[PDB]
Design a protein around this ligand. Structure first.
Ligand SMILES: Nc1ncnc2c1ncn2[C@@H]1O[C@H](CSCC[C@H](N)C(=O)O)[C@@H](O)[C@H]1O
Ligand SMILES: [Zn+2]
Lengths: 249, 46, 128, 135, 164, 416, 215
């Protein structure tokens, strides 16, 4: 479910929205009057459920931040379905009450709590474990090599993710990623471990998490990040979420 | 989008900080969609 | 300043960046794989959520915005009673009208339908 | 015990609503970052300042770094810590010219909405919930 | 014993009230901060304002304006002191949130909170008027509360043509 | 069947703003010999409300408080910088342009500032039309001693400020801002011609600001604009909004009113340009002969109160004659009015004739005519921008006096 | 013009230099000025006159000199040494950036061109035996002590040698280009050394540590 939606059973929805189903039947002349419109609802005539879906759309309900407003959708079964970050159900009748429910009580304009201004819907429990495992990077040092030592290169992040889908690399296996943006990698503020300086003018700066290739002859500046597909996946998910929302709006 | 590239680990206090910065920078409609995507990613990886 | 050469055509210095902006390379790009996400955003009604936030940026008080929308919605229903309550909701019509008044373009009342419905009688069933 | 306290807390301030833009008060509460008897916590002292509206101008030399009726952001507070800002006068619920209502400037920024608190907000009931709920 | 008329009472009440507010907020925030609970001082200051917003007319202050033992607002007492010398003598009093909830401007709010019979008997004997400014008052009456979306009340030229 | 059937600005001009959240809707930036402009890239249909044309984030602007004390929004001057002392030494009333010029030159020196990039699209010293850059020979072509003396005082004030604050002993971080007087004069010219003053609310603080706003300082002036500026406090964005209900055609220039109610000599002193259709321009008449104000307004379909005079273009059909000059004529001509007393035609003809004679006496003060000035502009090949501006100014005033003679001739006949 | 050689190591001078006759080298805590003889490539240095200033200031003083300096003009290639300060600043104003990425330069290396040849010379190589180091923290300039491990001595093919810089720009070793270490190897060596020490420190307090093996 989306954060702003909830699922209602047919048996609960038809009672909550009966007045609107009756009006929809009369408006579209599927029922002659109020008395006939009641019998079709009574007899579960299948045209009732088509109307119920229509009148429910765009009509929020109040569920009792103990009380919030959601956009209901019809679901199969007999239970009320709520999204994991959340019994009385109220249907606003007047347009004034429907405006307040949609514009003041929806679950996306109340993302901050009034106490100190903290976010309300931070991922928890299994969602949090998934992100932790995803972004726990490669093993290091004596946990990575049995002996003291006295990796694949990917042109872009999509090639690295594609190699992971083909089981060519693991989720936490280290890799080098060609980086064609600015240096925006959060890392310890440290000088290079080693600088390899060729006598023709090119020098390689090896940091703990990235390599920078520079020159005293050209203006080149090439960046390779030592990461995992897990870190790439987490970065892509947020970036594609931002780009997807922008394109859709 | 000028998102920083995190490269160490994302625990509970790190995700809470990121959401608050996303809200202040992008607003609540954007962050609400980001939360839905991040929530889906966490469930799938768990 | 004003210069004309031979044939009377004025000649002038075109202004150019003549300077390096590193924000040009890394910002005018695009992600290619968000088609599914974009289509779900419209399906769940998230577009109007951004529109509501857009309208509230032009409002000093969000409570008078709510009252004004309800007042405009009441006028729609009295004017045309039978067109509202089903696929077209009056409050949704008001919001889309107010976005279009800013010069942007939105479908009327954010109403959309499934084109792959296998004929009458069939209800799309939701996977919880 | 938490519900009984929440009911009493809500009852005592249930009538408090943001009813004016500016009560026009002159007084302010003085806050000092460098008390001579105890090293005050920086983060807590910053949190008690973010969102407050200034009651007087603040100067570093001849330069006004923040104006009267300007709300305090994170950037401004860090500037007062960096330089020798000894006293800051803010508008609080203790300075408003009323006990039956509060104005926007004496309340300050809304936490849920980022801007200055809007007219008509039932901030008394919000304060009652914000203390009762963590009980 | 040091200051004179509307200065001993005025300045003495300011010192007591300012000191009380500082210690009350610190004591409350000491409890929540030791348990890791973060609440903005705004919310606590709103409650404490109601606790420390009243003075008690002293037993010797008798006039046709105030009676001894009367509970009056601090701002009202300050303003009357500047304008009159009619034996306006008062001391700051700390009212607990229960006692402050029974000394409001709405007898309807008090009667629906606690001790309904005592509240209504006193109000009925003096013909008390409730102007319904608060929120719970209007909830009882079933009206629209004065907050949120309820705040601030929510033929010549015809038949005179050319014959042609 | 489909088978059988002003240059665009540098693409990087919009892009540097666009990557920093500048949005333009239905308009394009086009460059010509006379400078930049904003034009409707498509037919902008009317709506019930004003349409958003451009959105400019606050962080891309250079703003300073109109009133003391001088605070900068966003605050870019470091504490202790010597540039604040220079800004702080100015006259609070008169030296707003010096304060903005110091901020502008300081901004060009900052690596991260947007105006380091945006400054390359500002007119250069030989392309800016400000009269602060005008030579004494350019001021000789104005034919206006009052305006000339005003400009000379401005040039003297700007120069003396540079000599006082950019002497030999100042730090290098100050010297490198304005190495020469002409560099500082150019900055003041940019400040005068492009500053936009508005009342803004930033957070909880409402104040008047003098603002350097990129991409909105490309809107040209019109006394009948199709756009207006609107500060959006919640997200700190300056909006350019087209007028509600007004249809804008593709290619139409988008304009704002720089200076409501101001004459051409004020437009020349501030922005270094004038318009022939300025509805506020005045002409000194003796007042001996007066025409009927009510008749003159009705003959030309000028409606509204005197301070809101407008032409009902739908009551004239195709009369292109009535424009801002005729409105200016209504406000500047000697007039009488007696509630509803009608004017005698023979007495009004004597006034019209005497007013036309006085109009021709003023045209005879100018050594050349407005046609001879127009062809002088076409014949130019190596003229300074300010020289052409000075000629356009005197020609516009001649065109205005000539329009009055034409309007009086029409009015005298249409009174029958 | 002026020979600062042999002058005080931290005292201010009475005048303000003309900065366009100098190389300006900007570090985190200072600006370093070395006289620039005119040259089309702008890579000739006159070390007889050098100054150091606090950043973005025009108050000049003689830097500390910890090694003998070149007496004649020399051609040098410049490269900086430092780190990236990638932060996440607080978000005060609308659209305040999510991160800020800045470069912090702590050392600058001036590597002599071999025989002072130009960059566009087809026989251009670097002379790694003559490297001068500017340190921002101490506002000093010194010559690097370089260890040569390439066989060939002074007369060798300089096209084959690789300079390795370690230890915060304090250790300089010239190796043969065939002994180049993989960047992964460099990173993994550092991690193995650190985790090996940390693990032993963790295990030291177990009372059977003295009778146990590493494996
Ligand atoms: N209506 C008008 N007629 C002639 N010049 C105008 C004008 N409106 C604006 N300008 C010119 O535009 C300047 C204001 S800045 C407006 C855009 C400008 N062309 C630029 O390149 O940035 C003024 O100095 C004036 O010279
Ligand atoms: Zn107040």
């Amino acid at each position: 479910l989306s954060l702003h939606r909830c699922g209602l059973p047919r048996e609960i929805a038809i009672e909550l929205f009966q007045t609107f189903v009756i009006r929809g039947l009369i408006r579209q002349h599927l029922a002659s009057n109020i008395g006939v419109a009641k019998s079709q609802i009574r007899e579960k005539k299948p045209i009732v459920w088509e109307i119920l879906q229509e009148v429910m759309q765009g009509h929020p309900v109040l569920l009792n931040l103990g009380i919030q407003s959601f956009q209901p959708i019809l679901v199969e079964g007999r239970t009320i379905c709520l999204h994991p970050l959340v019994m009385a159900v109220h249907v606003p009748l007047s347009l004034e009450a429907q405006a307040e429910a949609r514009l003041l009580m929806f679950s996306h304009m109340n993302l901050l709590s009034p106490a100190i201004g903290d976010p309300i819907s931070v991922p928890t429990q299994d969602m949090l474990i998934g992100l932790y495992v995803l972004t726990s990077g490669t093993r290091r040092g004596i946990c990575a090599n049995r002996y003291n030592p006295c990796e694949p290169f990917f042109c872009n992040s999509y090639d690295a993710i594609g190699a992971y889908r083909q089981k060519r690399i693991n989720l936490d296996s280290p890799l080098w990623l060609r980086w064609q943006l600015d240096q925006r990698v959060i890392a310890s503020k440290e000088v290079p471990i080693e600088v390899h300086y060729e006598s023709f003018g090119n020098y390689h700066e090896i940091y703990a998490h990235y390599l920078i290739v520079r020159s005293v002859k050209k203006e080149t500046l090439y960046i390779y990040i030592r990461t995992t597909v897990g870190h790439i996946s987490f970065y892509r998910e947020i970036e594609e979420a931002i780009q997807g929302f922008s394109q859709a709006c | 989008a000028n998102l920083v590239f995190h490269n160490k680990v994302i625990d509970g206090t790190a995700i809470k900080r990121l959401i608050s910065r996303l809200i202040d920078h992008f607003g609540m409609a954007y962050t609400s969609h980001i939360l839905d995507q991040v929530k889906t990613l966490g469930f799938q990886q768990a | 300043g004003i210069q004309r050469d031979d044939n009377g055509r004025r000649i002038w210095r075109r202004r150019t960046l003549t300077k390096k902006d590193d924000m040009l390379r890394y910002k005018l790009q695009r992600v290619p794989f968000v088609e599914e996400q974009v289509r779900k955003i419209k399906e769940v009604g998230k577009v109007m959520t951004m529109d509501i936030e857009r309208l509230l940026l032009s409002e000093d008080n969000r409570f008078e915005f709510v009252n004004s929308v309800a007042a405009e919605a009441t006028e729609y229903v009295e004017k045309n009673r039978d067109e509202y309550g089903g696929t077209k909701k009056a409050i949704f019509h008001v919001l889309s009208n107010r976005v279009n008044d800013l010069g942007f373009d939105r479908p009327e009342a954010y109403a959309e339908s499934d084109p792959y419905k296998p004929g009458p009688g069939y209800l799309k069933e939701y996977y919880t | 015990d938490a519900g009984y306290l929440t009911r009493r807390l809500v009852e005592v301030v249930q009538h408090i609503v943001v009813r004016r833009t500016d009560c026009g008060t002159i007084r302010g509460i003085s806050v000092s970052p460098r008390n001579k008897s105890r090293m005050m916590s920086e983060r807590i002292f910053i949190q008690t300042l973010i969102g407050r509206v200034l009651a007087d101008d603040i100067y570093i030399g001849s330069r006004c770094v923040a104006f009267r009726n300007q709300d305090l952001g994170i950037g401004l507070v860090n500037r007062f810590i960096t330089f020798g800002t000894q006293s800051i006068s803010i508008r609080t619920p203790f300075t408003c010219r009323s006990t039956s209502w509060i104005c926007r400037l004496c309340y300050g920024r809304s936490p849920t909405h980022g801007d200055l608190v809007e007219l008509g907000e039932a901030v008394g009931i919000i304060a009652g919930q914000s203390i009762g709920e963590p009980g | 014993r040091i200051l004179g008329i509307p200065w001993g009472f005025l300045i003495g009440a300011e010192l007591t009230i300012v000191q009380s507010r500082i210690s009350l907020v610190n004591k409350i925030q000491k409890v929540y901060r030791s348990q890791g609970v973060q609440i903005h001082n705004r919310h606590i200051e709103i409650i404490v304002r109601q606790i420390t917003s009243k003075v008690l007319v002293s037993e010797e202050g008798m006039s046709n304006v105030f009676l001894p033992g009367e509970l009056i607002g601090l701002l009202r007492a300050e303003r009357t002191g500047r304008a009159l010398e009619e034996a306006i003598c008062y001391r700051a009093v700390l009212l607990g949130i229960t006692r402050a909830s029974l000394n409001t401007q709405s007898f309807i709010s008090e009667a629906s909170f606690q001790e309904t019979a005592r509240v209504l008997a006193k109000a009925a004997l003096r013909g008390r008027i409730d102007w319904l400014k608060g929120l719970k008052e209007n909830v009882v009456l079933g009206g629209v509360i004065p907050a949120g979306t309820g705040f601030n009340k929510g033929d010549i030229l015809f038949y005179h043509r050319e014959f042609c | 069947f489909p088978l059988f059937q002003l240059e665009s600005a540098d693409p990087d001009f919009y892009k540097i703003g666009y990557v920093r959240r500048v949005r333009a809707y239905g308009v394009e930036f086009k460059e010509g010999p006379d400078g930049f402009g904003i034009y409707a890239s498509k037919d902008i249909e009317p709506r019930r409300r004003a349409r958003v044309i451009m959105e400019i984030p606050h962080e891309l602007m250079i703003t300073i408080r109109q009133k003391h004390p001088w605070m900068f929004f966003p605050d870019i001057v470091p504490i202790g910088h010597p540039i604040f002392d220079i800004i702080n030494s100015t006259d609070p009333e008169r030296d707003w342009d010096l304060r903005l010029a110091c901020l502008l030159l300081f901004s060009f020196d900052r690596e991260d500032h947007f105006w380091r990039l945006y400054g390359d699209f500002l007119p250069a010293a030989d392309e800016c039309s400000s009269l602060l850059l005008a030579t004494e020979e350019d001021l000789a072509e104005l034919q206006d001693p009052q305006l000339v003396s005003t400009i000379r005082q401005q040039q003297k004030r700007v120069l003396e400020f540079w000599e006082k604050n950019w002497h030999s002993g100042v730090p290098l971080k100050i010297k490198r801002l304005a190495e020469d007087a002409e560099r500082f004069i150019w900055a003041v010219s940019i400040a005068q011609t492009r500053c936009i003053s508005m009342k803004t609310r930033i957070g909880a603080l409402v104040q008047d600001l003098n603002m350097m706003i990129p991409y909105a300082d490309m809107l040209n002036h019109s006394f009948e604009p199709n756009c207006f500026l609107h500060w959006r406090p919640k997200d700190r964005i300056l909006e350019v909004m087209s007028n509600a209900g007004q249809a804008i055609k593709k290619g139409e220039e988008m304009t704002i009113n720089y200076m409501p109610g101001q004459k051409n000599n004020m437009l020349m002193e501030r922005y270094g340009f004038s318009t022939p259709v300025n509805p506020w321009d005045a002409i000194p008449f003796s007042g001996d002969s007066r025409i009927h104000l009510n008749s003159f307004l009705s003959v030309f379909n000028i409606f509204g109160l005197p301070e809101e005079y407008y032409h009902d273009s739908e009551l004239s059909g195709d009369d292109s004659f009535v424009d801002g000059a005729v409105i200016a004529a209504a406000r500047t001509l000697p007039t009488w009015s007696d509630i509803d007393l009608p004017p005698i035609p023979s007495a009004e003809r004597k006034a019209v004739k005497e007013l036309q004679d006085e109009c021709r006496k003023m045209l005879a003060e100018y050594p050349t005519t407005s046609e001879q000035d127009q062809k002088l502009l076409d014949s130019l090949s190596e003229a300074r921008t300010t020289f052409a501006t000075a000629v356009k100014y005197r020609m516009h005033r001649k065109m205005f006096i000539g329009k009055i003679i034409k309007a009086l001739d029409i009015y005298q006949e249409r009174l029958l | 013009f002026i020979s600062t050689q042999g002058w005080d190591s931290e005292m201010v001078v009475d005048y303000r230099i003309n900065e366009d006759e100098f190389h300006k080298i900007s570090l985190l805590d200072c600006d370093f000025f070395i006289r620039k003889p005119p040259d089309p490539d702008n890579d000739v240095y006159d070390f007889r006159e050098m100054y150091v200033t606090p950043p973005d200031t025009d108050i000049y003083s003689v830097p500390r000199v910890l090694a003998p300096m070149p007496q004649k003009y020399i051609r040098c290639a410049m490269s900086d040494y430092g780190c990236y300060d990638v932060t996440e600043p607080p978000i005060d104003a609308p659209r305040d950036p999510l991160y800020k990425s800045e470069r912090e330069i702590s050392k600058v290396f001036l590597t002599k061109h071999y025989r002072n040849r130009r960059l566009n010379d087809p026989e251009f190589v670097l002379d790694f035996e003559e490297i001068y180091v500017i340190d921002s923290k101490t506002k000093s300039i010194t010559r690097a002590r370089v260890l040569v491990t390439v066989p060939g001595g002074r007369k060798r093919d300089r096209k084959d040698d690789l300079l390795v810089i370690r230890d915060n720009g304090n250790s300089f070793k010239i190796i043969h280009v065939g002994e180049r270490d993989d960047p992964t190897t460099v990173i993994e060596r550092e991690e193995w050394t650190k985790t090996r020490e940390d693990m032993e420190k963790h295990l030291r307090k177990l009372r059977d540590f003295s009778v146990s093996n590493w494996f």
